[PDB]
From a paper:
Instead, an HNH nuclease domain is naturally fused with one of the Cascade backbone components, Cas8, generating double-strand breaks in target DNA molecules. The RNP complex displays an overall G-shaped architecture, comprising single copies of Cas5, Cas6, and Cas8-HNH subunits, six copies of Cas7 molecules, and a crRNA molecule. To elucidate the molecular mechanisms of target DNA cleavage by the type I-F Cas8-HNH system, we reconstituted the Cascade complex and obtained multiple cryo-EM structures representing the target-free, partial R-loop, full R-loop and ssDNA-bound states.
In the full R-loop state, the whole 32-nt protospacer sequence on the target strand (TS) was observed to pass through a positively charged channel of the interlocked Cas7 subunits. In the protospacer sequence, every five consecutive nucleotides hybridize with the crRNA, followed by a single nucleotide kinked by a β-hairpin protruding from the Cas7 subunits, forming a periodic “5 + 1” pattern. In the target-bound state (full R-loop state, unless indicated otherwise), a 5-bp PAM-containing duplex (PAM duplex) was unambiguously traced based on the high-quality EM density. A lysine finger (Lys85) on the NTD stacks against the PAM duplex and forms a hydrogen bond with the base of -3dGNTS. An Asn-wedge helix (residues 193-198) protrudes into the target DNA and unwinds the double strands after the PAM site. Specifically, in the full R-loop state, Cas7.2 rotates outward around the axis at the Cas7.1-2 interface.
Residue numbers in the entry:
A (entry chain E): 0 to 254
B (entry chain A): 11 to 335
C (entry chain B): 11 to 233, 236 to 333
D (entry chain F): 1 to 10, 15 to 242, 244 to 337
Write the structure that this text describes.
Amino acid sequence: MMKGYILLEKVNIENANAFNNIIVGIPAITSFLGFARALERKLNAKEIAIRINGVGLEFHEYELKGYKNKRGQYVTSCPLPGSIPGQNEKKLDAHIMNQAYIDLNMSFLLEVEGPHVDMSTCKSIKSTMETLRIAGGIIRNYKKIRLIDTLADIPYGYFLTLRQDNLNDAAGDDMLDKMIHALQQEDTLVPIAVGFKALSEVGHVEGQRDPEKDHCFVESIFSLGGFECSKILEDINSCLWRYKTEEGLYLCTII
Amino acid sequence: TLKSRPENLSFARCLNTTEAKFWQTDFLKRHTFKLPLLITDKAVLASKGHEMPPDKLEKEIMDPNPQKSQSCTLSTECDTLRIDFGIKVLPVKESMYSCSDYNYRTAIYQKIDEYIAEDGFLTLAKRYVNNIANARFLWRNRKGAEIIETIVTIEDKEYPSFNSKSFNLDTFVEDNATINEIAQQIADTFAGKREYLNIYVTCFVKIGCAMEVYPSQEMTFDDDDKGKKLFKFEGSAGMHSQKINNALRTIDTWYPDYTTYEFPIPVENYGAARSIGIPFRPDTKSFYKLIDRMILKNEDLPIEDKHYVMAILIRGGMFSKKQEK
Amino acid sequence: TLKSRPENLSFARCLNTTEAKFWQTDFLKRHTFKLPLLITDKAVLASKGHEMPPDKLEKEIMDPNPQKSQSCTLSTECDTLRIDFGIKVLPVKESMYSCSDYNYRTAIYQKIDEYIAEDGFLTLAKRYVNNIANARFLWRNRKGAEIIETIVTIEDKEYPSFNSKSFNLDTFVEDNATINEIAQQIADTFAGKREYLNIYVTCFVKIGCAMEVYPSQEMTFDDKGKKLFKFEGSAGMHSQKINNALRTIDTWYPDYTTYEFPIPVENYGAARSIGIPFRPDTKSFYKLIDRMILKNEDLPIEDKHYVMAILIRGGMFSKKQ
Amino acid sequence: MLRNKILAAIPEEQKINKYIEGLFQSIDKNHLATHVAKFTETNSPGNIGAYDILSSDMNCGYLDTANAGWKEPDIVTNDAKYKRPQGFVAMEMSDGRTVMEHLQEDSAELRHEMEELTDKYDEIRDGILNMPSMQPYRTNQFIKQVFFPVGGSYHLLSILPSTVLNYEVSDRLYRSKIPKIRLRLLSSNAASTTGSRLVSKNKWPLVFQALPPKFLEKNLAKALDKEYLLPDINIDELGVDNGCLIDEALLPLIIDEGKRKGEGNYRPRHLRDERKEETVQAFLDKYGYCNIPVGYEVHHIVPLSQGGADSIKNMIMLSIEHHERVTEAHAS
DNA sequence: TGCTAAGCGCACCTAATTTCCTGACGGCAATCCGCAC
DNA sequence: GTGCGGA
């Protein structure tokens, strides 16, 4: 019954997950969209009807936990492991698996659709964001939660957008060769993770987190992305990530 | 009747801490002035003084040993160190992110409500505020200091300060008004009567003019370089959040043999402190056996074991049944 | 009841020394006037005078050799070098960073308490103040000096000065009142009767006008030239070089009556100067600490002096199994 | 040869019996896989994984395990004890070929060499040529489980990592110039615990680097621009009556403090703290007046334009005639 | 409290050659493995 | 409470 835009401005996230089996860097888009969905689910239990249908991701600064060597390469750092459940839980030294962590400052543009979208909604989002996480990281501080109307009320930064056309129109003989060639031609693009693909059928197995839902075994899928500034942008709708679900595919796309 | 712990149970931290950033100051101008502190590169020439087999000792006793390192020191015009971090407190019953069985959820919620009824999270909160009052988050930066001063701010109210050299690291005080007033609010946040609490902690340590500050050291695995690497947070020196939290959880004085060893240990699932290589709670007073005696075979425990179980649930972790294939 | 050393044993320093900063003054106006000293960039042309194989020597004997370097000298109007550093003294029973067995901790604490019961850390502390009094931390800046004066300040009391060209470098004085007065406070800090002590040291070296000053050089690891140490923009010295010059207090090695000189305190007694290891099998630290704690034997007092000197120096002393 | 080899890998005859006897008791415990579970946490009970042999698309917009060109499958067990087959099918023979390629064609080159060293090459070859596939049958606490919204409700998804894709990113990035990162966290013993051939061969993989552009990286310069200075004088006991500077000689003190602090720190507008009216409200409270005593103006002793905090401390109320003095001196 | 409005700021040509750029010794010890018997 | 098994 009404539609608007809410901006979450300059949020500090400390120690967010940065490993997706072929990528070390920016976290996957599904974590940010799940943060938006978790905020939606927590606002609807306080009897405040709202629906978040699109999120835009803006970047201001980053820091990867580690250091840069003299040759210009990164060496990651991980915390010291503690007690882990299993057969060797009573030991003093535990195992070291594969992990990576990142630090971010970002801003979020949320498209909300509900019966009322005033500043009391902004106060409720301010009261409901001090009990949530982004990726697996904690929120130290935010600056201000406010409503926006046009492109000129947005702070300066660089947004992330999908560039699937630059991947389907390149090289050949397999998709990974297209990925490597497209990354060698234009140097301002990054590989990102954009959702999941099925590896089995839907059913019920033993050992689930919730034993009353449907279950599928999945694999992560990867695509290409790029950065555009906030003063060279056309429309709000061309930087908003949304959910899309086919049969066997769970994705995140910019229509 | 319930027979085993559920197949998926998980908890989250209720005391979340942020990273610390270091500064240099002067003590008589410590409320107006601050300078950045940076890490430098140091390379040394040494001698081989490790224990070697007698064959290698005859060949390598007099050989040079260059190594690489890093260091952090104050300037020649500043004499104090300033440490600033922050803590977020969240409720206990809203920190269960997974529970497969519904009856175990009901039973554990009833047990936490009965713990709110008798000693509503006040003793544990008093111990956590004490471990902010004696400044145990200074690990090697507490040795050799003339004045240690700690200030705690909640919301927009600055509380009166602490002299952190007047508290002993082995006794817990329960008669200070400021500690009691912070502990009541942390108890109310733990008990559900509030929903979030934000604490800001600032510490001033006077060590001397050009003295050595000891930052946190990183665990990195590279083959070309093998040297000491220290933490750099936004260009300056700092300490990890995990270090400050271990210091805060050193509140356990209820292990089975405390009359022989009379120091408090950190709260862990088997009493495994990294200082002593023998676990302190290995079979009968462990977390799994006490929570299987509290919930699954309904029985009243002594209050110290309840204190330990609730402190483990504030710490967090993956607490589930042995996974079968 | 104790077999073996614990799997994680380490100690921490009880004499923490700061880095040194260098200044230039005049001797008659040294209490009211100090100027900064800086490092300059030099480049020199040379001749090929290194030893070469006979074939290459016939082709590369009259060839020029450009090289890069660095240097530090005083000005034309200044004649005195001023070096400033500081020392922090910490107790010895509270310098134990890691021990994985409680019984070994109790045994070590009992032997240190027996040491404080016989000699209250006084001989070693007198040797440490003696190495401040003769200015052994001036390594190559001590050759060719007219007057050397060293002042020691603790708190807000400036102790009377020292003439560092009247102390021999091979003998230790035990009759000087100022040395005894500082050494008693250092001994009380080592014992545990006080929690810390901060000592600041200032030294004046008259060497003349426009003469050379020798700072510390930085270590290079790959494939290099001469780089000198800079501390806050000025020249200076490493803390390790000063601390090595304050630990040359060992005169208890087995073959001291032949070579009558003090050596620095290490685990196997290795002298880099004179190329002989002096404590290689039976009087090393490992055998003595395994014959003191693990078999309860009363050693002579000189071996106890060596063991407590190593435990004031610090290190990693861990056994595998 | 496959001779000396089967000995290096430990009389000299009971030996060759031990290897081949130990081999046949384990060729029914090795399965084939493209996705394995203990590559995330090696404490996952069982042999849970998958074999995805499906069809490519080549123009879909996304990379997967079926759109890339994986060339070699993977062989996986549950316990390291049982891992001889993966070594056995890895020993290179005389022609620089792998037991694998010879067992698919049966060139007698092997036919001959095995039959002198064993009596059961027939049974072994059938158990390396028809191998069972890995099946996903259950889940545990060590496999990552997440929720995903599907049409008014949710689906629970368990993510399994890809072993064949990790091996082919690392080979195709060792000969390339795009940014990459090497992870050196897995040891040799823990790699064997995973049970896969491709992880015990590549235990320190090479992966993609995906970072924001390099003008947006934190440093000390972009951290001293979010802090603000405060003065070194407390007016409350300092020549001043109720906030107003009575002594004309104390003006130079304000000029020298403003000259000292915030001298060479110019900050553009975007980098300046706002000027909220509450602080000049809060300053007056301490001294009353309910109103600015006209003929006086609030001056931040440290310009909020050369770096200064918008705080009660960083202001002092001075006369307009005095104010014309200070705003010109600090401008100059 | 006010301190100007307009226009414009060259065309040419070039920027050296030789010889060489060190010899030594060395670059840590500890720990980070599930599983079937 | 042991010892296996690879790269």
